[PDB]
Amino acid sequence: SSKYPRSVRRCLPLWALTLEAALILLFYFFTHYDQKGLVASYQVGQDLTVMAALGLGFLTSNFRRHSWSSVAFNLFMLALGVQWAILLDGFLSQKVVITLFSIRLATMSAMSVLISAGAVLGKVNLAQLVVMVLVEVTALGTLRMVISNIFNTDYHMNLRHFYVFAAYFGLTVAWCLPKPQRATIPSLSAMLGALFLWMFWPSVNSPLLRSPIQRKNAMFNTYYALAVSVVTAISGSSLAHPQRKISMTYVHSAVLAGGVAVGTSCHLIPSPWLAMVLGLVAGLISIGGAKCLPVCISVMHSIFSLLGLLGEITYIVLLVLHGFQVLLSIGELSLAIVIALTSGLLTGLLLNLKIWKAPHVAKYFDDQVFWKFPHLAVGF
Amino acid sequence: ALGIKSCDFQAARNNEEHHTKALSSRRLFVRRGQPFTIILYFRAPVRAFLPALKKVALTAQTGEQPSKINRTQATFPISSLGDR
Amino acid sequence: DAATSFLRAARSGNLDKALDHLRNGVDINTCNQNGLNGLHLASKEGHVKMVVELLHKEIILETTTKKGNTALHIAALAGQDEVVRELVNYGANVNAQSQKGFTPLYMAAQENHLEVVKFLLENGANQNVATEDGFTPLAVALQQGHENVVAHLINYGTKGKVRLPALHIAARNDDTRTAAVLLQNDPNPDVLSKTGFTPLHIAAHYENLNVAQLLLNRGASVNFTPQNGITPLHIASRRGNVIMVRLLLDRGAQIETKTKDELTPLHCAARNGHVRISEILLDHGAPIQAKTKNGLSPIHMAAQGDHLDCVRLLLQYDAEIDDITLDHLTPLHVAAHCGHHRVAKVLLDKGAKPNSRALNGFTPLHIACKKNHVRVMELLLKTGASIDAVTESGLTPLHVASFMGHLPIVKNLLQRGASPNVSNVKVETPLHMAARAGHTEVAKYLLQNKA
Amino acid sequence: EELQDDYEDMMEENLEQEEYEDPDIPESQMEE
């Protein structure tokens, strides 16, 4: 097989333009438009957009020669995912009325895919990412619809499982990919992205809560848990390292451990000390996973999945205080995990198709595959 | 449409090339690692060479209980991409 | 349409379809709209067998596409290490430049193909060749962040061609097809390696008769003499290649050629014990009394190596049995020095003088007693060697044996009646020699016998 | 490996150019 990348001058433009034309046609046929707090409602969605673009594009840009692709592909995936998620959430919760709240929900749905893509960035091209975006948005919408139909929950309120869904979907897709690093300036850019994610994660911890009191309590808990998690992660990076130094890449992923741990139950926490305890437990679990998971591909995605599972478990624990309820919650969690694994397997099987012109395994984590650089021999 | 009439092993030429000419000119004595030439005759003319080439495979067996794990049996196709 | 099918088969690796199309009459040098022929398409997809088959079909190796890229350029850009090796072995120019000045080394360096970079650098690729924009493989490797390529390019520098020429490799492996393709490309069969040897020298070394005959038919020099004077006939005689010796003599090899040490092929055959080669050379007119810079004749070489049958053959061809070197060493002296009692017996049975004198008056008996060679001593004493013979310094064999401490030789000499009362020019006795070297046992036996 | 014979140094070692030269005349004078 030729290690030189195949020409995508006819596959990628045709695919992207066809997707955009289909999106425009569907918006024309199925979408319709529509006060005092318009700016206040827009600010939450703006924070979600800022996270999804900046933090999730630069957080994976820590690679030595794959930061361009990480950032630009994250932007492209967000732009496609919001547009497709608007239509999918309109279809599965019913025409589609487009509001700021629907834009916020589609932004969360795209954030799920952006989190999943971190396990597969550096090993796929743009068309495979488009396929992953479409399939993952459809699978998350189907999971939310099934949960709403079975457990009598709300379709928009089933978006709380997006941490665990994104993590397991990303791991499952990365498992199916063919088997195959850092620099200072890309690490600083990833630190900027991680800082933005850490600062604005309280917004993503309460976009679905309606009452102001629950949102305020959730933001308090997320803020304190995130502070505790940052302290614990920066402290314990030296413990879980053979060189006895602090790993910047580990910090980039473990800054968010407390926010992930308290994400599903930030409104149920009645006092900030419990949130701080949860953040400390999240940080210690992150240290343990960083020290143990590589022994038994993406370590950060694996510890993110472990943190999401821990957050679900502590939600189960906290829900009892505030038999059949535990069974319903565990069944919902198991259904989410099974659907995420099945959809990840399907997406990985579709991503191995030869028609996508995937990069060679020896050309992984390189921007030279997808980007033009001067003084290069082109073609044969 | 691909019947086999006979198979000429060309014992004399191969034995002279494989330095076994003093053994016999009728039986085929060949040495390992060196090519030997045989001629395969068909009862009927072959219309298309490539499909018929894809339809034929050769098997060499030695011993009373040939097997692939014992390296006493080997099945190989007739093609130019084979491992010489 | 048939040419299109042939190109598609070349691209897809279907060698049978390509061979069928070539048999039907499809032009071998056909190409698509981009100028890529079957060789280019095969090199892009890593089909080594297709490349070999097309090269065997007299395809033009140095064909360039519309971008100026050869097959080697495409193979280096695609990262096909095996195809790059095969193309280089068949004579691809590693320093060829494209329209914009790109080289195969540049294409391998820009795509982080470290193995291809290593192979091209070992095969003579010049990293100092720049494109039309002034960029170098080192510069483009630095630009793209290929750290291993940069490190290897810096470390290698200008080490140059460390590999043999492709014709030498073909002659080593007796590859007649590769050699035929190389000679079709480069008509000269006498290409020189860094050591100075032609591929005919390699063919004679390994007795690769087929490639040697091919080179001799294409116009190779059968008597090509490098600075060291080692002809292919010399190598064939030294290596024991009888059939190669016969082939070289049939093609017109000179038999009296001397190396820088004045070694004839007869000397090389005799020092290694090749009786058949020596007989063939002597039947073709090899001088049997040729002497090297040290005065050694072929019989000296045969006696040095304990080559008994070679000594017999040389003596059968009227060799001087008492030929002397610059040190006046007869072949009997050489046999005594090396301890070859069989060679000494053969020489003595045919009339070699047992009491021949060297420069310092040493007899073969003296040298046999010096080197603790008891069997040679017994054979010489049987054949009339003087047990009381003296050197120019008056040294008896007992003197030398006592000084060297060889107790069994001293015991045998004293049992055969040698007198320990003999004296040197310094009047010293064998007891003096034993006492001056601390040989307690030899001195004790000398005291017990007659001292 | 199995390809060292394609290089100049290994081929030079294999050809054994020292075997085509007269090494020396062994005298080994007994005088101390």
The tally of beta strands of chain A, per DSSP, is 2
Whole-Å distance between the termini of chain D? 51 Å
Q: DSSP strand (E) fraction of chain D?
A: under 5%
Shape of chain A: globular
> What is the helical fraction of chain A, as a range of percent?
55-70%
Number of strands of chain D: 0
Number of helices of chain D: 1
Sequence of secondary-structure elements of chain D: H
Order of helices and strands of chain A: HEHHEHHHHHHHHHH
The largest sheet of chain D, given as strand count, sense and whether it forms a barrel, is: none
Overall structural class of chain D, as computed from helix and strand content, comes to mainly alpha
Question: What is the CATH topology of chain A?
Answer: Ammonium transporter fold
Question: What is the count of helical runs of chain A?
Answer: 13
- State which percent range the strand residues of chain A make up: under 5%
Most residues in contact, chain pair and counts: C-D, 44 and 22 residues
Radius of gyration of chain D: 17 Å
Count of discrete domains of chain A: 1
* Rg of chain A, nearest Å: 20 Å
User: Could you name the CATH class of chain A?
Assistant: Mainly Alpha
Tell the overall outline of chain D.
Answer: rod-shaped
What would you give as the CATH superfamily of chain A?
Answer: Ammonium transporter AmtB like domains
Structural notes for this entry:
This is part of a larger assembly, with chains A (380 residues), B (84 residues), C (451 residues) and D (32 residues). Chain A is built from 13 helices and two strands; from the N terminus they run αβααβαααααααααα. Chain A has helices at 12-30, 38-58, 67-92, 100-117, 126-151, 162-176, 184-205, 212-236, 248-254, 257-261, 272-292, 299-321, 324-351; strands at residues 31-33, 96-98. In chain A, strands 1-2 form a two-stranded parallel sheet. Chain A is globular. Chain C has a domain at 1-157. Helices cover 54% and strands 0% of the residues of chain C. Chain D is 25% helix and 0% strand. Chain D has one helix at 8-15. The radius of gyration of chain D is 17 Å and the shape is rod-shaped. The termini of chain D are far apart. Chains in contact: A-C, B-C, C-D. Chains C and D meet through helix 11, helix 13, helix 15 and helix 25 of C and helix 1 of D. Chain D: This is Band 3 anion transport protein.
